[PDB]
């Protein structure tokens, strides 16, 4: 709303409402690569991003779309998919050589048992070192997909297929 | 200003955070057997006594609140540099 020469417009990423620069400053002071976990309504995405004066650089990247080749047919936008994507991201980053980072959830609310923390647990369980406290993780049953009992009978196959996708994703990086 | 009577802080002796009770420090009576008291009695004679005939000076507008922090575990107190307040109470 540029009223005049004395008006101050925010940064572009702040105008778009996509970044918190105070949090970003707090995260950059680590001098560690950020494990950037973002989720849309239909899938979840994880990145390993290091800062540069010219702009952020990404080291590793896993999306929910990559799980479907390993034998996953459930929804990509729930806890099991988020955990599996986190596991794949951690294993891929270990293959690349990068093995440390801090969790960057950005503007996403921090809620125990969230998809973000399921992806975080998947990253942790792959050996990828990242500071955290276990109380924010989802229960292991709902990482397996016990919410399938809610309304859908077809969702009842989520635990065994989650185990199968997990074992195949481990095998790809074994 | 109010300070809690009991709060958790660092004990320099046990080297941990324990509950500590705050106690106001009362100035003691000067001993008559200290070297300055003996010197005053020795310099007492006829005439001016030097520094022992000085009258005590004034006062600052507010004095510091002399507080002492005794650990509830080791029962040892330590005293820190203290604030300067007109009215001081303990929060109970």
């Amino acid at each position: 709303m540029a009223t005049g020469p004395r008006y101050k417009v925010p940064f572009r990423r702040r105008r778009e409402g996509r970044t918190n620069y105070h949090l970003r400053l707090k995260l950059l002071l680590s001098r560690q690569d950020r494990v950037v976990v973002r989720k849309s309504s239909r899938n979840v995405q994880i990145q390993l991003i290091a800062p540069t004066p010219d702009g952020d650089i990404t080291y590793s990247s896993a999306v929910s779309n990559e799980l479907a080749k390993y034998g996953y047919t459930g929804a990509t936008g729930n806890t099991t998919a988020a955990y599996l994507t986190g596991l794949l991201f951690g294993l891929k980053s270990l293959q690349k050589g990068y093995e440390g980072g801090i969790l960057d959830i950005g503007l996403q609310a921090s809620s125990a048992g969230s998809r973000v923390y399921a992806a975080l647990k998947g990253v942790v369980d792959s050996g990828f070192e990242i500071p955290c406290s276990p109380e924010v993780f989802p229960p292991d049953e709902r990482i397996r997909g016990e919410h399938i009992a809610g309304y859908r009978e077809e969702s009842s196959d989520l635990p065994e297929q989650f185990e199968a996708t997990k074992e195949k994703i481990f095998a790809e990086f074994s | 200003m109010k300070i809690p009577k009991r709060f958790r802080t660092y004990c320099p002796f046990c080297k941990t955070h324990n509950e500590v009770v705050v106690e106001r420090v009362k100035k003691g009576q000067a001993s008559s057997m200290t070297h300055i008291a003996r010197q005053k009695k020795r310099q007492e004679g006829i005439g001016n006594s030097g520094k022992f005939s000085k009258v005590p000076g004034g006062d600052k507008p507010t004095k510091r609140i002399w507080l002492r922090y005794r650990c509830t575990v080791c029962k040892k107190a330590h005293q820190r540099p203290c604030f300067r307040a007109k009215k001081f109470e303990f929060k109970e």
């Binding site: 020469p5 004395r6 008006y7 101050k8 417009v9 925010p10 940064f11 620069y21 105070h22 970003r24 400053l25 950059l28 002071l29 001098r31 800062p51 004066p53 | -």
Partner: protein, 96 residues
């Protein structure tokens, strides 16, 4: 009468331009300088920690070490060499 505080005569020295007020770009806070590098001292008023004296505003210092987040600079002040500590938010590399 006139005082002798650090913030003496700092009305415009420690002021920001109109369209740079607010949260500063965070890239300036995570820049690294090598030993012996020449950096300018351009104090950011919004970053109130690790700020050198305004007397050293506009001076180029040589990096001589690091003391945590801050950098130790050798800054010439008149005819003396002063050791100035600064967070990178107030620093800026010299360009050749």
């Amino acid at each position: 009468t006139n005082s002798h505080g650090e913030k003496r005569c700092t009305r415009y020295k420690l002021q920001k331009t109109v369209r740079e007020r607010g949260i500063s770009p965070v890239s300036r806070a995570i820049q690294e300088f090598e030993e012996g590098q020449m950096v300018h001292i351009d104090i950011d008023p919004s970053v109130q920690k690790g700020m050198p004296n305004p007397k050293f505003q506009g001076s180029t210092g040589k990096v001589i070490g690091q003391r945590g987040r801050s950098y130790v600079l050798e800054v010439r002040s008149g005819n003396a060499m002063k050791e100035v500590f600064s967070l990178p938010q107030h620093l800026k590399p010299q360009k050749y």
